[PDB]
Design an enzyme around this catalytic site. Structure first.
Site, PDB file in Angstrom:
ATOM      1  N   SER A   1      13.097  33.277  13.644  1.00  0.00           N
ATOM      2  CA  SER A   1      13.593  32.895  12.332  1.00  0.00           C
ATOM      3  C   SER A   1      14.386  31.621  12.540  1.00  0.00           C
ATOM      4  O   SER A   1      15.305  31.610  13.365  1.00  0.00           O
ATOM      5  CB  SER A   1      14.461  34.014  11.748  1.00  0.00           C
ATOM      6  OG  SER A   1      15.384  33.506  10.821  1.00  0.00           O
ATOM      7  N   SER A   2      14.017  30.557  11.839  1.00  0.00           N
ATOM      8  CA  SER A   2      14.755  29.307  11.950  1.00  0.00           C
ATOM      9  C   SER A   2      14.688  28.872  13.416  1.00  0.00           C
ATOM     10  O   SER A   2      13.602  28.898  14.015  1.00  0.00           O
ATOM     11  CB  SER A   2      16.166  29.530  11.377  1.00  0.00           C
ATOM     12  OG  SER A   2      17.020  28.410  11.625  1.00  0.00           O
TER      13      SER A   2
END
Ligand SMILES: [Zn+2]
Lengths: 315, 317
Positions: free
Chosen positions: A97-98
């Protein structure tokens, strides 16, 4: 039986003294941190590890210096992955994520840790040299507010809906501070994330061409360990050229990623990111009785070793 | 830079003499066909290959006998895959449709070809022993007709929508022939597919119990090459114990599979099934200028060697 998902969070989940118990009491973790710290120190000028464990900073001081936080998140996450690997706890999937998509890519075999760390350092440097500062704001309320009251959030961009009472926006500093003022008059709770750039928004666009050019100087492998990506919301088998830019530029589809996994399996989720942010999200997204399919390790309670013992029952 | 998708069609796409040029001119294709032929002949009692290439039977004669067409489709598809792999042309994704999900799974490593062929043979045998015959009909018109004029299609089940002007229904012979009569009075064009069972409908439910028992006797691997399934319209990482029954029983979601793949990247699509059916569909589902990202190999023009040349320039740089 059911697969183990190793999950990696990105910017905004870091904090000072994250994983200090493992840095001191776990040789695999400490050695991995020290090894990467030497690489990073070359490029930055100073030690990342000494900033993470800065004795003048508390957990509550925002760790928002991009040159330190960008590499710090990866180093923390990859070192903990080595800990699990050393204990023979192996991922069936990685989920990034990210910035966590870098750690996911590195654990998958797309790139080795040293090259990924380099890619992260260059991104941090390029963003700092080219982009205005900005803010990311968590809204502890319903994403439906974005539709009913769009004016509340003008001059910001939605970067993530994490569950039914949590979403995150990104924008210029003054624009975000005004939204905060407006939210308070509506009794809508919010929380600034510890970042100094409006990641996952057009306000880091000035960094794109330089980072694109830098990425062309690198060569990456195909995933070996199966990847599920927040950036795409699904399994990721073939990576395009700009993946590592979009990991920081594009909004997240974390709920779609979790939904995809839950459609195929009843996974166990292990959050390898600092703060246990993703494990908290997942617990909100899956049936209540399945909350013990999800655990985190690195949290400000500094109980990493107790938590690693918990992870052993996922085996 | 654009990933390669190998697509595999199912019942309804076969025809006599499919692939005869590959069988005569391509050693890898021929040998793969003869190897599977010996396995298949043990269960059907005679060569599949000699039926496919029977000189007295024409492309226009429906190749609808399940005992021969079920193995023939898989054999053709897997042998063509071997041709491509021998040339170094590798799939990033495989996409199965109807019976073609068995070839997708074999290519993926879910099962070896010989074991997947056994599953196909068993399925053909059980359906023949337990089910009434039936028909499948392609309607060359808008699937909106199904909502606007449902009585036109009474006593048939919708099995596939393939693009904006093509959908397929399945049911009993007499019911299907009645629908065709009614469609003609409406100037709605249709085409009977060359099949003798109402696949993808409840009319093959008499076979489910025995086939599911047989499937429990098997053990399958996880996919090594990403499979995008028409059964689910998405990438399939687990296939449950009914998957290979569902592959011929459940309605398909081919448009969803194609939209899923195109949402991740612009793909190059190679139809390894006979007739180029899936390529034709894909050409209608993606922009018109993007038609050169899609090709077929095995078609009644018997131009496989020319088409294999075309595939060469699909190769990732
Ligand atoms: Zn997948």
């Amino acid at each position: 039986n059911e697969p183990l998902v190793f999950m990696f969070s990105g910017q905004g989940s870091q904090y000072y003294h994250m994983g200090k118990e493992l840095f001191k009491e776990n040789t695999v973790f400490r050695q991995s941190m020290l090894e990467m710290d030497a690489i990073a120190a070359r490029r930055i000028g100073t030690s990342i590890v000494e900033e993470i464990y800065h004795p003048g900073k508390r957990v509550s001081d925002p760790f928002d210096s991009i040159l330190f936080s960008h590499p710090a998140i990866f180093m923390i996450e990859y070192s903990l992955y080595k800990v699990l690997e050393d204990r023979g706890i192996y991922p069936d999937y990685v989920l990034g994520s990210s910035l966590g998509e870098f750690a996911a890519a590195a654990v998958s075999g797309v790139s080795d840790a040293e090259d990924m760390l380099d890619c992260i350092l260059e991104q941090a440097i390029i963003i700092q040299n080219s982009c205005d500062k900005g803010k990311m704001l968590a809204i502890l309320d319903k994403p439906q507010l974005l539709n009913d009251h769009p004016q509340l959030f003008g001059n910001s961009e939605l970067i993530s809906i994490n569950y039914d009472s949590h979403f995150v926006i990104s924008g210029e500093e003054d624009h975000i501070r005004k939204i905060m003022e407006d939210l308070k008059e509506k009794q809508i709770l919010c929380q600034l994330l510890p970042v100094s750039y409006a990641f996952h928004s057009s306000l880091i666009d000035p960094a794109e061409s330089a980072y694109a050019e830098f990425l062309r100087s690198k060569s990456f492998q195909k995933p070996s360990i199966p990847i599920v990506s927040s950036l795409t919301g699904s399994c990721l088998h073939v990576m395009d050229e700009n993946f590592f830019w979009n990991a920081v530029r594009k909004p997240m589809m974390f709920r779609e990623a979790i939904r995809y996994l839950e459609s195929q399996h009843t996974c166990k989720f292990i959050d390898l990111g600092p703060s246990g942010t993703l494990a908290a999200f997942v617990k909100q997204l899956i049936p209540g009785d399945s909350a013990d399919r999800c655990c985190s390790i690195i949290t400000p309670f500094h109980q990493e070793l107790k938590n690693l013992n918990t992870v052993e029952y996922f085996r």
